[PDB]
């Protein structure tokens, strides 16, 4: 039920209409959400650094990789959140297409 | 350089120094002064002198007139009188602090010393002004 409530809460605020009114959008969301139940992200530091560097170069920024490196340390301070790399890959994917 | 033999370079530098007449040249770093000197160099016949790279620009804390007066007033009763002296009442100094120095490596660093370098600088500034 969590994927369903997630999708409905996202569609009721991001979109002005629910995606149950357009069954194509609802079907696409429900068939995308259920593909796998484990994160599929690059969990290596080298690959994360490469992705951040390529994102910043496509952003025409060549000095904020140090900032991303420092921020991922504060993220990895606890060492109890193993999908911080997952959320960083999510942000990478959401920022790569328009950039 | 110091004795201004082949002084066409000094005639060329007159016009560069003329753009700076308000404040002493020591207020500005000598790197751009040496850049102007070297860009004036290649327009004059100076290729056959592999010794001008030992010349450097020093920013004296006093102008030519003031330094000369203090040298000729030290160890004398004139220092008290001319301790208030300034170059504003006299000719203004905007290029009279430029001087030449000759820094050379050892053991040629033994031949040239700062005691001689001060006299060199004073003479060169006086000649140049």
């Amino acid at each position: 039920k969590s994927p369903n409530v997630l999708l409905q809460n996202l569609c009721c605020r991001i979109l002005g209409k629910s995606e149950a009114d357009v069954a194509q959008q609802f079907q696409y969301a429900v068939r995308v959400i259920g593909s796998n139940f484990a994160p599929t992200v690059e969990r290596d530091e080298f690959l994360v650094a490469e992705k951040i560097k390529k994102e910043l170069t496509r952003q025409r920024r060549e000095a904020d990789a140090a900032l991303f490196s420092e921020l991922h340390r504060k993220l990895h301070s606890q060492g109890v959140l193993k999908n911080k790399w997952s959320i960083l890959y999510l942000l990478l994917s959401l920022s790569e297409d328009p950039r | 350089y110091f004795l201004m033999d082949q002084g066409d370079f000094f005639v060329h530098f007159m016009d560069l120094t003329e753009e700076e007449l308000k404040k002493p040249v020591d207020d500005i770093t000598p790197t751009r002064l040496e850049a102007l000197l070297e860009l004036a160099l290649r327009m004059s016949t100076a290729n056959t002198d592999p010794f001008k790279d030992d010349l450097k620009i020093d920013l004296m804390p006093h102008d030519l007139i003031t330094q000369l007066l203090r040298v000729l007033a030290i160890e004398t009763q004139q220092e008290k009188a001319m301790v208030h002296a300034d170059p504003t009442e006299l000719t203004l100094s905007g290029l009279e602090a430029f001087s030449f120095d000759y820094v050379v490596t050892w053991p040629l660093s033994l031949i040239i010393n700062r005691k001689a370098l001060t006299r060199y600088q004073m003479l060169f500034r006086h000649m140049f002004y």
């Binding site: 170069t57 496509r58 025409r60 060549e62 000095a63 140090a66 | 500005i28 770093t29 790197t31 751009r32």
Partner: protein
């Protein structure tokens, strides 16, 4: 277990306590250097007691120095005539230091109709093939074919069509046997300087785009001048930015690339030792590093450069949009003529252009003012001379 890049540096080590009192520090260093040179000549070049205590302070140092000199000379000769050390140096000058005029700007000139087009239909493999094809006609024919194989270019890929001005970086490397002349860090700094000069070339290319547009399209069409008022409002700011950025380009391409490349070339030309060529490479690296002004402690200069680049990009984009809109309107007018509302809309479109160009001019003036203030108030006389030359530009 020493890499091929350090057969002369750390192929052998020195033990401080294990050095006699009849053999000095430089004596031991030269002994280690000679042994490392001999081992390097064996491995990679593939081609050709009481008296010892007494003669330490008479001629032992001279013998050590002569042996080290001869071994280093033979190693350098073997590398130059076998592994193309000089050719690799020239390749890195040509590719990562802009030493022979062709590359990045030509790629931008070719891709200008294609860069705006989607990069999902343009991939780095096609541009790699284009570079390989066009480098043969260039100086890369001097480079070994393995060098052209190790040379590529990165460009826009997988995009719906957008800015590609700041994404262009030549990458260059040398082969194993010749990589003892050019170290890993050397190639990395060559790549970094190539990226910096690519940013500079993109800024200069935006400036040249503006310049060529306002030199040519003016003499390519004669129409009503009522639209020329907003054009002049935009173009006063655009010309001030043009002069500023041409001043910047002339200063940077002279005090960043050229001096370092000339020093490196002169040192390598007179270099008969591997230590000499290494020092030449290090001096080139340091000279490129010194004038970057993009480090963390240079945050003000970095932000000013980023603001200037963004201003140039925005001005180029707005000029292109204005030109496209004017072309569309005048083409519609010509079609109507061939086949009043058109003229009315073309005039109404002018005041918005004038207002937005006034805003852009004010923003550019402010940013340039803050950049000039930062240059002048600094204790570096180089920035003060740059500000003086900018005022000499008769734009500020």
């Amino acid at each position: 277990a020493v890499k091929a890049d350090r057969l002369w540096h750390d192929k052998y080590a020195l033990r401080k306590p294990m050095i006699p009192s009849f053999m000095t520090m430089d004596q031991c260093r030269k002994v280690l250097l000679i042994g490392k040179s001999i081992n390097f000549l064996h491995q990679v070049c593939h081609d050709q007691a009481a008296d010892l205590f007494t003669d330490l302070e008479n001629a032992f140092q001279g013998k050590i120095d002569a042996a080290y000199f001869e071994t280093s000379k033979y190693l350098l000769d073997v590398l130059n005539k076998k592994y193309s050390l000089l050719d690799h140096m020239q390749a890195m000058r040509r590719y990562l230091l802009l030493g022979q005029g062709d590359f990045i700007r030509h790629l931008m000139d070719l891709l200008k109709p294609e860069l705006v087009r989607p990069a999902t239909t343009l991939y780095q493999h096609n541009l790699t093939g284009i570079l390989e094809t066009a480098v043969r006609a260039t100086n890369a024919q001097f480079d070994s074919p393995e060098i052209l194989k190790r040379l590529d270019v990165r460009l826009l890929e997988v995009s719906p069509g957008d800015t590609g001005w700041d994404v262009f970086s030549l990458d260059y490397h040398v082969d194993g046997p010749i990589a003892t002349v050019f170290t890993r860090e050397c190639m990395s700094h060559y790549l970094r300087a190539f990226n910096f000069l690519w940013r500079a070339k993109r800024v200069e290319y935006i400036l040249t785009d503006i310049r060529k547009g306002h030199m040519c399209n003016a003499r390519l069409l004669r129409s009503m001048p009522e639209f020329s008022g907003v054009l002049h409002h935009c173009h006063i700011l655009a010309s001030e930015m043009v002069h500023f950025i041409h001043q910047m380009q002339y200063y940077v391409t002279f005090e960043v690339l050229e001096c370092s490349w000339d020093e490196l070339w002169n040192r390598v030309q007179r270099a008969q030792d591997l230590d000499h060529i290494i020092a030449a490479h290090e001096a080139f690296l340091g000279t490129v590093i010194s004038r970057c002004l993009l480090d963390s402690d240079s945050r003000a200069l970095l932000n000013q450069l980023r603001a200037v680049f963004d201003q140039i990009i925005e001005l180029q984009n707005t000029q292109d949009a204005i030109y496209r809109a004017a072309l569309e309107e005048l083409q519609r007018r010509l079609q109507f003529e061939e086949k009043k509302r058109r003229v009315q809309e073309f005039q109404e479109s002018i005041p918005k252009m004038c207002s937005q160009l006034r805003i852009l001019t004010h923003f550019y003036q402010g940013v340039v003012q803050q950049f000039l203030v930062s240059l002048t108030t600094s204790s570096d006389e180089s920035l003060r001379f740059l500000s003086f030359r900018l005022d000499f530009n008769e734009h500020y």
